[PDB]
């Protein structure tokens with residue numbers, strides 16, 4: 152949610168900033184609703200003035216021994232219209248709120264203005280994509296060899312876009328997730344958390360997936376119970392820890408890390424696109440003055456995972472036309488994928504500003520004013536575990552089809568140094 | 572599903588054995604349907620044959636497993652037999668606190684934030700308690716893979732109906748599952764246990780005799796919409812480290828003893844006193860022939876509480892899955908036997924760790940085997 156006062160009073164300036172995202176604000180409808188509101192409010196004011204006078208004129212008519220029936224009938228009619236005037240103003244405000252819940256965030260001034268994906272800038276890249284002396288295999292060819300990565304058995308259980316891992320590939324996947332959590336808790340100042348993987352609608356509305364992106368979620372419809380949704384990311388559960396709270400300035404920043412499955416009902420082959428995937432999520436609840444510096448740190452934390460695994464990657468600053476709904480500024484990390492001869496997305500790191508904090512009423516008590524003020528929220532993958540496994544399998548492949556274990560993962564691989 | 576030959580050749584004995592579970596086998600309806608199929612065959616139309624076949628198959632999928640002759644005969648939980656114990660429950664020199672009071676002290680176990688997010692029967696864990704939960708699950712999976720011969724697996728947590736019918740949750744227990752209704756697609760169900768995904772790896776296959784035993788281990792969330800039940804004891808979501816075995820039918824009752832010892836080892840290494848209960852015929856799970864429950868000591872309750880269920884399913888799930896192996900003696904593809912057991916339910920291990928390891932000041936001492944996973948933390952709070 153944007154600032155309601157800003158959208159209602161400056162719809163033209165808000166529309167112009169939003170147009171950079173390709174989003175066309177319904178300025179004609181905001182102004183029409185605002186014209187209707189002003190018209191009803193002026194009618195209720197004139198009626199309040201008329202009814203109050205008539206209601207007190209009954210007292211005076213009584214003192215004169217006069218008939219009060221014409222006056223009571225006037226007051227009663229006026230009262231009934233004021234009650235409708237309230238219903239009209241409530242239904243106008245109701246329509247305006249429903250509309251404001253579907254508006255994407257305002258891009259920060261520093262975001263490059265672009266109409267599409269081609270206006271995204273490379274910020275920097277790290278490491279050098281390996282030149283192989285043999286024909287590179289993809290992660291599907293590599294992992295299927297001994298049945299350690301099995302899409303057929305997963306299709307037999309659950310249908311398309313699911314995976315089954317066994318033996319050393321399953322251990323390598325767990326090693327990756329354990330390495331990420333241990334790194335963020337030991338070196339990057341994040342507090343570990345275990346969260347529900349099923350949330351009710353209010354949590355998803357707090358982070359921006361609801362009301363607009365319901366069709367992308369798996370829903371559990373329940374009889375006489377509030378429906379449950381499978382989390383698309385631990386961002387939903389972690390960010391909402393602070394909903395409806397006034398935090399002390401001393402408690403900021405709150406930094407959370409969670410390793411959870413992620414469920415989405417939205418080449419893309421093998422493990423690139425899945426209905427379920429593990430992701431180690433980083434979430435920060437910060438002082439608004441520090442959120443853009445916090446984003447730089449958050450991005451460096453996700454990068455550190457790739458540097459430690461020695462995986463060549465690239466950092467992209469997303470343009471205005473290529474951002475997520477609730478983001479003011481995003482950096483995408485893209486890992487080198489040898490079988491594709493390109494870098495592919497492995498993490499998105501965003502500053503949401505006060506957009507999610509507004510929806511969930513997550514606040515802090517400002518020290519200067521003493522007044523409760525909205526916090527800023529940030530989130531970032533550090534990393535999507537299945538995609539890192541794809542990167543590990545492909546970048547560490549040997550000529551015989553075996554896989555070298557990355558150095559930082561050997562303590563988790565129980566003596567295994569080469570897979571197959 | 573039960574052997575169709577046994578149901579036909581020995582109806583009275585199969586019915587008398589099932590009656591020890593409190594299940595009344597409808598021999599009359601089964602044999603009346605068999606007579607109708609035989610009469611319709613001698614005349615052959617397709618409508619009446621498919622209706623009789625659909626009726627018979629639906630009945631057949633509703634019959635629980637035959638209890639093994641070594642299973643104590645009883646009507647309820649009070650007839651379950653304690654077969655052994657391990658360890659001495661601790662005598663505390665202060666008033667014992669439950670895991671809820673222990674965990675809630677610094678916000679590290681938070682039922683209120685979880686309720687705000689998801690409603691009742693959910694949990695949120697933070698900092699050293701979340702780290703201890705993760706340490707427990709890592710310990711269990713590292714133990715089973717390194718010492719007990721189990722191959723690790725990452726599985727889907729959403730399955731379609733045939734996998735649940737393969738292990739016995741469907742058709743009879745649909746109400747206990749969280750279903751995802753999918754428009755113009757097969758509905759998905761959240762897994763109640765990794766037993767569903769692990770056991771079904773071998774469905775529709777003829778394995779090699781040399782491939783047996785197949786021993787799988789997985790750490791997964793478990794989702795169910797179903798004595799003291801406070802906090803993490805009962806949840807809609809909980810983590811469980813599951814052990815599954817696909818074995819030669821001749822070895823399955825020795826394999827159950829080995830599976831039960833694997834689960835027990837986690838409790839021994841954590842130094843958590845417990846007891847082993849041989850479930851009676853009237854307290855057994857639908858798909859089981861024989862079950863041992865592990866019940867860990869819970870100081871706040873002054874009693875042992877269930878933390879694991881180890882079962883031999885015989886050929887029951889194999890029949891539903893058509894999971895076979897090529898018999899080296901005969902040459903014929905024969906049904907395999909299947910087994911599963913918790914090693915362990917992670918949330919309930921955490922309850923047991925918090926309570927048994929608590930100290931006078933409300934702090935919790937970290938179990939010895941968990942210290943390598945706790946980043947220097949030896950005392951929680």
Ligand SMILES: Cn1c(=O)ccn([C@@H]2O[C@H](COS(=O)(=O)NC(=O)[C@@H](N)CO)[C@@H](O)[C@H]2O)c1=O
Nearest residue numbers: 384386423424425428496497498499531532535
């Ligand atoms: C397997 N798989 C998918 O099918 C889809 C996405 N991803 C990775 O997940 C990362 C984070 O997803 S996101 O871009 O929608 N952003 C978030 O979820 C925020 N909570 C920040 O993480 C993407 O960068 C993909 O690499 C998959 O792995």
Ligand SMILES: Cn1c(=O)ccn([C@@H]2O[C@H](COS(=O)(=O)NC(=O)[C@@H](N)CO)[C@@H](O)[C@H]2O)c1=O
Nearest residue numbers: 764766804805806809877878879880912913916
């Ligand atoms: C939190 N919680 C529950 O809410 C319910 C059960 N349990 C434990 O899970 C163990 C295994 O569940 S079971 O008995 O249904 N058996 C199986 O699922 C098999 N696949 C073997 O694991 C129970 O023993 C409870 O201790 C919870 O922890």
Ligand code: NA
Nearest residue numbers: 483496498499
């Ligand atoms: Na992205």
Ligand code: NA
Nearest residue numbers: 864877879880
């Ligand atoms: Na049980």
